[PDB]
Coordinates of C-alpha atoms and ligand atoms in Angstrom, one line a residue:
Chain A
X1 CA 36.4 82.8 -22.8
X2 CA 39.8 84.3 -23.3
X3 CA 41.2 85.3 -26.7
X4 CA 42.9 82.5 -28.7
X5 CA 44.2 82.4 -32.2
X6 CA 42.1 82.3 -35.3
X7 CA 38.3 82.1 -35.9
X8 CA 36.3 83.0 -32.8
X9 CA 33.8 80.3 -33.7
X10 CA 32.6 79.3 -30.2
Chain B
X1 CA 38.3 57.5 -47.5
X2 CA 35.2 59.2 -48.9
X3 CA 37.2 61.9 -50.8
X4 CA 39.6 59.3 -52.3
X5 CA 38.3 59.7 -55.8
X6 CA 38.5 63.5 -56.0
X7 CA 41.6 65.3 -57.3
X8 CA 43.7 67.0 -54.7
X9 CA 43.4 70.3 -56.6
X10 CA 39.6 70.0 -56.7
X11 CA 39.4 69.3 -52.9
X12 CA 41.4 72.5 -52.3
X13 CA 39.2 74.5 -54.6
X14 CA 36.1 73.0 -53.0
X15 CA 37.5 73.8 -49.5
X16 CA 37.8 77.5 -50.5
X17 CA 34.2 77.4 -51.9
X18 CA 33.0 75.9 -48.7
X19 CA 34.7 78.6 -46.7
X20 CA 32.9 81.3 -48.8
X21 CA 29.6 79.4 -48.3
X22 CA 30.3 79.1 -44.5
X23 CA 30.0 75.3 -44.8
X24 CA 32.8 74.4 -42.4
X25 CA 31.9 70.7 -42.0
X26 CA 32.3 70.3 -45.8
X27 CA 35.4 72.5 -45.7
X28 CA 37.0 70.2 -43.1
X29 CA 36.1 67.0 -45.0
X30 CA 37.6 68.4 -48.2
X31 CA 40.8 69.4 -46.4
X32 CA 40.9 66.0 -44.6
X33 CA 40.7 64.4 -48.1
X34 CA 43.5 66.7 -49.3
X35 CA 45.7 65.8 -46.4
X36 CA 45.1 62.1 -47.0
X37 CA 46.6 62.5 -50.5
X38 CA 49.9 62.3 -48.7
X39 CA 51.6 65.4 -50.1
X40 CA 52.8 68.1 -47.8
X41 CA 50.5 71.2 -47.5
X42 CA 51.4 74.7 -48.6
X43 CA 51.1 77.7 -46.2
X44 CA 47.6 78.5 -47.6
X45 CA 46.5 74.9 -47.4
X46 CA 47.6 74.6 -43.8
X47 CA 45.5 77.7 -43.0
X48 CA 42.5 76.2 -44.8
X49 CA 42.9 73.0 -42.8
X50 CA 43.1 75.0 -39.5
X51 CA 40.3 77.4 -40.2
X52 CA 37.9 74.5 -41.2
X53 CA 38.4 72.4 -38.1
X54 CA 38.6 75.5 -35.8
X55 CA 35.1 76.5 -37.0
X56 CA 33.7 72.9 -36.6
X57 CA 35.2 72.3 -33.1
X58 CA 34.2 75.9 -32.1
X59 CA 30.5 75.2 -32.7
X60 CA 30.9 72.0 -30.6
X61 CA 32.7 73.7 -27.8
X62 CA 30.1 76.5 -27.6
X63 CA 27.3 73.9 -27.6
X64 CA 29.1 71.8 -25.0
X65 CA 29.5 74.8 -22.7
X66 CA 25.7 75.6 -22.9
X67 CA 24.8 72.0 -22.1
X68 CA 27.4 71.7 -19.3
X69 CA 26.0 74.9 -17.7
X70 CA 22.4 73.5 -17.8
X71 CA 23.6 70.2 -16.4
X72 CA 25.4 71.8 -13.5
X73 CA 22.3 74.0 -12.8
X74 CA 20.3 70.7 -12.9
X75 CA 22.6 69.2 -10.2
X76 CA 19.0 61.7 -17.6
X77 CA 18.3 63.7 -20.8
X78 CA 20.7 66.7 -20.2
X79 CA 23.6 64.4 -19.2
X80 CA 22.9 62.1 -22.2
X81 CA 22.8 65.0 -24.7
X82 CA 25.9 66.7 -23.2
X83 CA 27.6 63.4 -23.5
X84 CA 26.5 63.1 -27.2
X85 CA 27.9 66.5 -28.0
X86 CA 31.1 65.7 -26.0
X87 CA 31.7 62.5 -27.9
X88 CA 31.3 64.2 -31.3
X89 CA 33.7 66.9 -30.1
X90 CA 36.2 64.3 -29.0
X91 CA 35.8 62.6 -32.4
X92 CA 36.7 65.8 -34.2
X93 CA 39.8 66.3 -32.0
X94 CA 40.8 62.7 -32.6
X95 CA 40.5 63.1 -36.3
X96 CA 42.7 66.3 -36.3
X97 CA 45.3 64.7 -34.1
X98 CA 45.2 61.7 -36.4
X99 CA 46.0 63.8 -39.4
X100 CA 48.8 65.5 -37.6
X101 CA 50.4 62.2 -36.6
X102 CA 49.7 60.5 -40.0
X103 CA 51.8 62.1 -41.3
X104 CA 51.8 65.9 -41.3
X105 CA 54.2 66.5 -38.3
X106 CA 56.7 63.9 -39.3
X107 CA 57.1 65.3 -42.8
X108 CA 57.2 69.0 -41.6
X109 CA 60.8 70.1 -41.7
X110 CA 60.6 73.9 -42.1
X111 CA 60.0 75.9 -39.0
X112 CA 56.8 77.5 -40.3
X113 CA 55.1 74.2 -41.0
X114 CA 56.5 72.3 -38.0
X115 CA 55.5 75.0 -35.5
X116 CA 52.1 75.4 -37.2
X117 CA 51.2 71.7 -36.8
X118 CA 52.7 71.4 -33.3
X119 CA 50.6 74.4 -32.2
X120 CA 47.5 72.6 -33.7
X121 CA 48.4 69.4 -31.7
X122 CA 48.5 71.5 -28.6
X123 CA 45.2 73.2 -29.4
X124 CA 43.3 70.0 -30.0
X125 CA 44.6 68.3 -26.9
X126 CA 43.6 71.5 -25.1
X127 CA 40.1 71.1 -26.5
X128 CA 40.0 67.6 -25.2
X129 CA 41.3 68.8 -21.8
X130 CA 38.3 71.3 -21.6
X131 CA 35.9 68.3 -21.4
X132 CA 38.2 65.7 -19.7
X133 CA 37.8 64.5 -16.2
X134 CA 40.2 63.0 -13.7
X135 CA 43.4 61.1 -14.8
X136 CA 42.7 61.0 -18.5
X137 CA 42.7 64.8 -17.9
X138 CA 46.2 64.8 -16.5
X139 CA 47.7 62.8 -19.5
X140 CA 45.7 64.9 -22.0
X141 CA 47.0 68.1 -20.3
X142 CA 50.6 66.9 -20.5
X143 CA 50.2 66.1 -24.2
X144 CA 49.0 69.6 -24.8
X145 CA 51.9 71.1 -22.8
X146 CA 54.4 68.9 -24.6
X147 CA 53.3 69.9 -28.0
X148 CA 53.1 73.6 -27.2
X149 CA 56.6 73.4 -25.6
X150 CA 58.2 71.8 -28.6
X151 CA 56.5 74.4 -30.8
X152 CA 57.7 77.2 -28.6
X153 CA 61.3 75.9 -28.5
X154 CA 61.5 75.8 -32.3
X155 CA 59.7 79.1 -32.8
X156 CA 62.1 80.9 -30.4
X157 CA 65.1 79.6 -32.3
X158 CA 63.8 79.9 -35.9
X159 CA 61.3 82.7 -36.1
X160 CA 61.4 86.4 -35.3
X161 CA 59.4 87.5 -32.3
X162 CA 56.8 89.2 -34.5
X163 CA 56.1 86.1 -36.6
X164 CA 52.3 85.7 -36.6
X165 CA 52.6 81.9 -36.1
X166 CA 54.9 82.4 -33.1
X167 CA 52.6 85.1 -31.7
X168 CA 49.5 82.9 -32.1
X169 CA 51.3 79.9 -30.5
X170 CA 52.3 82.0 -27.5
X171 CA 48.8 83.4 -27.2
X172 CA 47.3 79.9 -27.1
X173 CA 49.9 78.5 -24.8
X174 CA 49.3 81.3 -22.4
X175 CA 45.6 80.5 -22.3
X176 CA 46.5 76.9 -21.8
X177 CA 48.5 78.0 -18.8
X178 CA 45.7 80.2 -17.4
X179 CA 42.6 78.0 -18.0
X180 CA 43.9 74.5 -18.3
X181 CA 47.1 74.2 -16.2
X182 CA 45.9 76.5 -13.4
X183 CA 49.1 78.5 -13.9
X184 CA 47.9 82.1 -14.2
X185 CA 51.3 83.6 -13.3
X186 CA 52.9 81.6 -16.1
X187 CA 50.1 82.7 -18.5
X188 CA 50.7 86.3 -17.6
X189 CA 54.5 86.1 -17.8
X190 CA 54.3 84.4 -21.2
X191 CA 51.8 87.0 -22.6
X192 CA 53.8 89.9 -21.3
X193 CA 57.2 88.7 -22.6
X194 CA 55.7 87.8 -25.9
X195 CA 54.0 91.2 -26.3
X196 CA 57.1 93.2 -25.3
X197 CA 59.5 91.2 -27.5
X198 CA 57.2 91.6 -30.5
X199 CA 56.9 95.4 -29.9
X200 CA 60.7 95.7 -30.0
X201 CA 60.8 94.0 -33.4
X202 CA 57.9 95.9 -35.1
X203 CA 60.4 98.5 -36.6
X204 CA 61.7 95.7 -38.9
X205 CA 58.4 95.1 -40.6
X206 CA 56.6 96.3 -43.7
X207 CA 53.1 97.9 -43.3
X208 CA 51.4 94.7 -44.1
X209 CA 53.5 92.5 -41.8
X210 CA 53.0 95.2 -39.1
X211 CA 49.2 94.9 -39.4
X212 CA 49.4 91.1 -39.2
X213 CA 51.6 91.1 -36.1
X214 CA 49.8 93.9 -34.2
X215 CA 46.5 92.1 -34.7
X216 CA 47.7 89.2 -32.6
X217 CA 49.5 91.4 -30.1
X218 CA 46.1 93.1 -29.4
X219 CA 44.7 89.6 -28.4
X220 CA 47.7 89.3 -26.0
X221 CA 46.8 92.7 -24.6
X222 CA 43.1 91.8 -24.4
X223 CA 44.0 88.8 -22.2
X224 CA 46.5 90.7 -20.0
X225 CA 43.7 93.3 -19.4
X226 CA 41.4 90.6 -18.2
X227 CA 44.1 88.9 -16.1
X228 CA 45.8 91.9 -14.4
Chain C
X1 CA 14.3 55.3 -37.5
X2 CA 17.3 56.3 -35.5
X3 CA 15.3 57.9 -32.7
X4 CA 12.9 55.0 -32.4
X5 CA 14.2 53.8 -29.0
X6 CA 14.0 57.3 -27.3
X7 CA 10.9 58.3 -25.3
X8 CA 8.7 61.0 -27.0
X9 CA 9.1 63.2 -24.0
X10 CA 12.9 62.9 -24.0
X11 CA 13.0 63.8 -27.7
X12 CA 11.1 67.0 -27.0
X13 CA 13.3 67.8 -24.0
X14 CA 16.4 67.2 -26.1
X15 CA 15.0 69.3 -28.9
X16 CA 14.7 72.2 -26.5
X17 CA 18.2 71.7 -25.2
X18 CA 19.5 71.6 -28.8
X19 CA 17.8 74.9 -29.5
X20 CA 19.5 76.5 -26.5
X21 CA 22.8 75.0 -27.8
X22 CA 22.1 76.3 -31.3
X23 CA 22.4 72.7 -32.6
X24 CA 19.7 72.9 -35.2
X25 CA 20.5 69.7 -37.1
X26 CA 20.2 67.7 -33.8
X27 CA 17.0 69.7 -33.0
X28 CA 15.5 68.7 -36.3
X29 CA 16.4 65.0 -35.8
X30 CA 14.9 65.0 -32.3
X31 CA 11.7 66.6 -33.6
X32 CA 11.5 64.2 -36.6
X33 CA 11.8 61.4 -34.1
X34 CA 9.0 62.9 -32.0
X35 CA 6.7 63.3 -35.1
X36 CA 7.4 59.6 -36.0
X37 CA 5.9 58.6 -32.7
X38 CA 2.6 59.1 -34.4
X39 CA 0.9 61.4 -31.8
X40 CA -0.3 64.8 -32.9
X41 CA 1.9 67.8 -31.9
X42 CA 1.0 70.5 -29.4
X43 CA 1.4 74.2 -30.4
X44 CA 4.8 74.4 -28.7
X45 CA 5.9 71.2 -30.4
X46 CA 4.8 72.4 -33.9
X47 CA 6.9 75.5 -33.3
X48 CA 9.9 73.4 -32.2
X49 CA 9.6 71.3 -35.4
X50 CA 9.3 74.5 -37.6
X51 CA 12.2 76.4 -35.9
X52 CA 14.5 73.4 -36.2
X53 CA 14.0 72.7 -39.9
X54 CA 13.9 76.5 -40.8
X55 CA 17.3 76.9 -39.3
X56 CA 18.7 73.8 -41.1
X57 CA 17.3 74.7 -44.5
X58 CA 18.2 78.4 -43.9
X59 CA 21.9 77.5 -43.7
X60 CA 21.6 75.5 -46.9
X61 CA 19.7 78.2 -48.8
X62 CA 22.4 80.8 -47.8
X63 CA 25.1 78.5 -48.9
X64 CA 23.4 77.6 -52.2
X65 CA 23.0 81.3 -53.0
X66 CA 26.7 81.9 -52.4
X67 CA 27.7 79.0 -54.7
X68 CA 25.1 79.8 -57.3
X69 CA 26.4 83.4 -57.5
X70 CA 30.0 82.1 -57.9
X71 CA 28.8 79.7 -60.6
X72 CA 27.0 82.4 -62.6
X73 CA 30.1 84.6 -62.4
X74 CA 32.1 81.6 -63.6
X75 CA 29.8 81.4 -66.6
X76 CA 33.5 71.4 -63.0
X77 CA 34.1 72.0 -59.3
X78 CA 31.8 75.0 -58.6
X79 CA 28.9 73.3 -60.4
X80 CA 29.6 70.0 -58.6
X81 CA 29.7 71.6 -55.2
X82 CA 26.6 73.7 -55.8
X83 CA 24.8 70.5 -56.9
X84 CA 26.0 68.8 -53.7
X85 CA 24.5 71.5 -51.5
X86 CA 21.4 71.6 -53.7
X87 CA 20.8 67.9 -53.3
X88 CA 21.2 68.1 -49.5
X89 CA 18.7 71.0 -49.4
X90 CA 16.3 69.1 -51.6
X91 CA 16.7 66.2 -49.2
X92 CA 15.8 68.3 -46.2
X93 CA 12.7 69.7 -48.0
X94 CA 11.7 66.1 -49.0
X95 CA 12.0 65.0 -45.3
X96 CA 9.8 67.8 -44.1
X97 CA 7.2 67.3 -46.8
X98 CA 7.3 63.6 -45.9
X99 CA 6.5 64.3 -42.3
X100 CA 3.6 66.6 -43.2
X101 CA 2.1 64.0 -45.5
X102 CA 2.8 61.0 -43.1
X103 CA 0.7 62.0 -41.3
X104 CA 0.7 65.4 -39.7
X105 CA -1.7 67.2 -42.2
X106 CA -4.3 64.4 -42.4
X107 CA -4.6 64.2 -38.6
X108 CA -4.7 68.1 -38.1
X109 CA -8.4 69.1 -37.6
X110 CA -8.1 72.3 -35.7
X111 CA -7.5 75.4 -37.7
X112 CA -4.4 76.4 -35.8
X113 CA -2.7 73.1 -36.6
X114 CA -4.0 72.6 -40.1
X115 CA -3.1 76.1 -41.2
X116 CA 0.4 75.7 -39.6
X117 CA 1.2 72.5 -41.4
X118 CA -0.2 73.7 -44.8
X119 CA 1.9 76.9 -44.5
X120 CA 4.9 74.7 -43.9
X121 CA 4.1 72.6 -46.9
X122 CA 3.9 75.8 -49.0
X123 CA 7.2 77.0 -47.5
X124 CA 9.2 73.8 -48.3
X125 CA 7.8 73.6 -51.8
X126 CA 8.8 77.2 -52.2
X127 CA 12.4 76.4 -51.0
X128 CA 12.4 73.6 -53.7
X129 CA 11.2 76.1 -56.2
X130 CA 14.1 78.5 -55.4
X131 CA 16.5 75.9 -56.8
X132 CA 14.3 74.2 -59.4
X133 CA 14.7 74.6 -63.1
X134 CA 12.2 74.1 -66.0
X135 CA 9.0 72.0 -65.8
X136 CA 9.7 70.4 -62.5
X137 CA 9.8 74.1 -61.5
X138 CA 6.3 74.6 -62.7
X139 CA 4.8 71.6 -60.9
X140 CA 6.7 72.5 -57.7
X141 CA 5.4 76.1 -57.9
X142 CA 1.9 74.9 -58.3
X143 CA 2.3 72.6 -55.3
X144 CA 3.5 75.6 -53.2
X145 CA 0.6 77.7 -54.4
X146 CA -2.0 75.0 -53.7
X147 CA -0.8 74.5 -50.1
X148 CA -0.7 78.2 -49.4
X149 CA -4.1 78.7 -51.0
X150 CA -5.8 76.0 -48.9
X151 CA -4.1 77.4 -45.8
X152 CA -5.3 80.9 -46.7
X153 CA -8.9 79.7 -47.3
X154 CA -9.0 78.1 -43.8
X155 CA -7.3 80.9 -42.1
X156 CA -9.7 83.6 -43.4
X157 CA -12.7 81.5 -42.3
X158 CA -11.4 80.3 -38.9
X159 CA -8.9 82.8 -37.5
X160 CA -9.1 86.6 -36.7
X161 CA -7.0 88.8 -39.1
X162 CA -4.5 89.4 -36.3
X163 CA -3.7 85.8 -35.6
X164 CA 0.1 85.4 -35.9
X165 CA -0.2 82.1 -37.9
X166 CA -2.5 83.8 -40.4
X167 CA -0.2 86.8 -40.6
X168 CA 2.9 84.7 -41.1
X169 CA 1.1 82.7 -43.8
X170 CA 0.1 85.8 -45.6
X171 CA 3.6 87.2 -45.3
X172 CA 5.1 84.1 -46.9
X173 CA 2.5 83.7 -49.6
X174 CA 3.1 87.3 -50.6
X175 CA 6.8 86.6 -51.0
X176 CA 5.9 83.5 -53.0
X177 CA 3.9 85.7 -55.3
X178 CA 6.7 88.3 -55.6
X179 CA 9.8 86.1 -55.9
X180 CA 8.5 82.7 -57.2
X181 CA 5.3 83.3 -59.1
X182 CA 6.5 86.5 -60.7
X183 CA 3.3 88.2 -59.5
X184 CA 4.5 91.3 -57.8
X185 CA 1.1 93.0 -57.9
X186 CA -0.5 90.1 -56.2
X187 CA 2.2 90.1 -53.6
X188 CA 1.7 93.8 -52.9
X189 CA -2.1 93.5 -52.8
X190 CA -1.9 90.6 -50.4
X191 CA 0.6 92.3 -48.1
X192 CA -1.5 95.5 -48.0
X193 CA -4.9 93.9 -47.4
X194 CA -3.3 91.7 -44.7
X195 CA -1.7 94.6 -43.0
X196 CA -4.8 96.9 -43.1
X197 CA -7.2 94.2 -41.9
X198 CA -4.9 93.3 -39.0
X199 CA -4.5 97.0 -38.0
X200 CA -8.3 97.2 -37.8
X201 CA -8.5 94.3 -35.4
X202 CA -5.6 95.3 -33.0
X203 CA -8.1 97.0 -30.6
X204 CA -9.4 93.5 -29.6
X205 CA -6.0 92.3 -28.3
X206 CA -4.2 92.2 -25.0
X207 CA -0.8 93.8 -24.7
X208 CA 1.0 90.5 -25.3
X209 CA -1.1 89.5 -28.3
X210 CA -0.7 93.1 -29.6
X211 CA 3.1 92.6 -29.5
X212 CA 3.0 89.3 -31.3
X213 CA 0.7 90.6 -34.1
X214 CA 2.5 93.9 -34.6
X215 CA 5.9 92.1 -35.0
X216 CA 4.7 90.3 -38.1
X217 CA 2.8 93.3 -39.4
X218 CA 6.2 95.1 -39.3
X219 CA 7.6 92.4 -41.7
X220 CA 4.7 93.0 -44.0
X221 CA 5.5 96.8 -43.9
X222 CA 9.2 96.1 -44.5
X223 CA 8.4 94.2 -47.7
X224 CA 5.9 96.8 -48.9
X225 CA 8.6 99.4 -48.4
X226 CA 11.0 97.5 -50.6
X227 CA 8.2 96.8 -53.2
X228 CA 6.6 100.2 -53.5
Chain D
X1 CA 16.0 88.5 -49.6
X2 CA 12.5 89.7 -48.6
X3 CA 11.2 89.2 -45.1
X4 CA 9.5 85.8 -44.4
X5 CA 8.2 84.2 -41.2
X6 CA 10.3 82.9 -38.4
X7 CA 14.1 82.5 -38.0
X8 CA 16.1 84.6 -40.4
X9 CA 18.6 81.7 -40.7
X10 CA 19.8 82.3 -44.3
Ligands
LF5_1 C1 49.7 81.8 -47.3 C2 48.6 82.8 -47.7 C3 48.4 83.0 -49.2 O1 47.5 82.1 -47.2 C4 47.2 82.4 -45.9 C5 48.1 82.9 -44.9 C6 47.6 83.2 -43.6 C7 46.3 83.0 -43.3 CL1 45.8 83.4 -41.7 C8 45.4 82.5 -44.3 C9 44.0 82.3 -44.0 C10 43.3 81.8 -45.2 C11 41.9 81.4 -45.3 N1 41.1 81.5 -44.3 N2 41.4 81.0 -46.6 S1 44.5 81.7 -46.4 C12 45.8 82.2 -45.5
LF5_2 C1 44.7 60.3 -22.4 C2 44.6 61.0 -23.8 C3 46.0 61.0 -24.5 O1 43.6 60.3 -24.4 C4 42.6 60.7 -25.2 C5 41.3 61.0 -24.9 C6 40.3 61.3 -25.8 C7 40.7 61.4 -27.2 CL1 39.5 61.9 -28.4 C8 42.0 61.1 -27.6 C9 42.5 61.2 -28.9 C10 43.9 60.9 -29.0 C11 44.7 60.8 -30.3 N1 44.2 60.8 -31.4 N2 46.1 60.8 -30.2 S1 44.4 60.6 -27.4 C12 42.9 60.8 -26.6
LF5_3 C1 2.7 77.5 -27.7 C2 3.8 78.2 -27.0 C3 4.0 77.8 -25.5 O1 4.9 77.8 -27.7 C4 5.2 78.7 -28.7 C5 4.3 79.5 -29.4 C6 4.8 80.3 -30.4 C7 6.1 80.3 -30.8 CL1 6.6 81.3 -32.1 C8 7.0 79.4 -30.2 C9 8.4 79.3 -30.5 C10 9.1 78.4 -29.6 C11 10.5 78.0 -29.7 N1 11.3 78.5 -30.5 N2 11.0 77.1 -28.7 S1 7.9 77.7 -28.5 C12 6.6 78.6 -29.1
LF5_4 C1 7.8 68.1 -59.2 C2 7.9 68.2 -57.6 C3 6.5 67.9 -57.0 O1 8.9 67.3 -57.4 C4 9.9 67.4 -56.4 C5 11.2 67.7 -56.7 C6 12.2 67.7 -55.7 C7 11.8 67.2 -54.4 CL1 13.0 67.1 -53.1 C8 10.5 66.8 -54.2 C9 10.0 66.3 -52.9 C10 8.6 66.0 -52.9 C11 7.8 65.4 -51.8 N1 8.3 64.9 -50.8 N2 6.4 65.4 -51.9 S1 8.1 66.3 -54.5 C12 9.6 66.9 -55.2
CL5 CL1 21.2 62.2 -26.8
CL6 CL1 31.3 68.2 -54.4

């Protein structure tokens, strides 16, 4: 998974 | 709905408590109730809404990926249970999109709120696209693209290139391009131009704004490093 | 109930999938449905049941502690939300105790199953005791003690001192003594005698049994180190 | 919290 905004909840 | 008898202020207070307790489903339900009071949300409240649902859908996405991987290796129980998680995920995305369209986006006039909500609309259509198949996939993808594009147009005209909302939007739209739209070159171009234009504007910021902006720039760099 | 139309075998398979996906609420609901089929559970199935509910109640306990801490610092929203989490926690404990009493314990004849379930009964009364106040607290505490004691009596007569179920029971009963019954000396005595008697029996084990037993002995040592 | 059996889920 690539970095996206906000909590890295997955 | 179920939070209709609770004061707006108590729902916000309880959302913050839920966050501290890492009870994100509760946090999301409190913020949904707060939205349904019909008043616009403050910056802090928008962030509580986003953090809550991001954590909820994040758990579902991770679970869906685990089950999808097992299913593919297997190729009715695995398919049935993957479908169950998938439907729950779609339900959460549907709920968030419903809040945005009734009536958060239409009442959002300031750039910071309008861009924030349109980015969320892009994000939750993107989460739908991750599990979509076929033609529904095409229309879902175009709905994500359309929301991101409107958000980007406003952000470029109304916010400085270091604005964290603008930066986070560009970050997510570039991942949309890379992962969803099968447009890796567009993803790389967007992440690079966003990073470079923010770097050139850092001299205008206070130490605290500098820290906020450079944190998201680092995520852009992390992706570029994996992509180039 | 809600899982009544699903095959026992599919519920077990889906419980294992849920575990892999870290969907512990689903895992617990699948195992509850499997229990309600009325057949005794295998060793693996008992462990799936325990792992599922331990993860669910564990999240609730952690959340309850966060909110209780905030409430105490504050001394209606904090109290109301702590109560909400507390009632949900009590509901999960009630559900587990209900499964044990209808009819897992009464059909468990072998030591390994009977001790396992009686330890669970002790554990979930202990979780109730953590949030209980006053006299209800006293009766809850005595129900935990009674279940642990019957489990201990059987375990000492029917299992070797290195048996992981016996070891885990003694570990939990010693924490009951320390934290719940305000009997730190009893807790320390139990943890020490359990550790020492297991050590003396390690020579009888295979390398894999050795690893299983020493893992729980290390938890006994961790507690003794904090207690002495 | 002291060590107890099984998943350390709290
Ligand atoms: C407007 C200020 C006071 O509130 C915020 C701004 C930006 C962010 Cl990212 C944020 C995250 C928050 C949370 N997780 N509770 S509050 C909050
Ligand atoms: C073809 C696309 C647009 O269709 C969907 C598929 C699945 C879901 Cl959950 C969903 C939710 C939607 C909404 N609330 N606006 S559209 C939509
Ligand atoms: C009887 C054997 C085959 O099954 C087990 C024994 C002991 C434990 Cl601790 C355990 C935990 C399990 C899980 N989390 N799926 S299965 C399982
Ligand atoms: C005074 C004690 C024995 O009372 C309780 C308080 C709270 C709960 Cl959740 C509960 C569940 C119980 C069960 N299912 N056997 S007894 C009990
Ligand atoms: Cl299912
Ligand atoms: Cl509440």
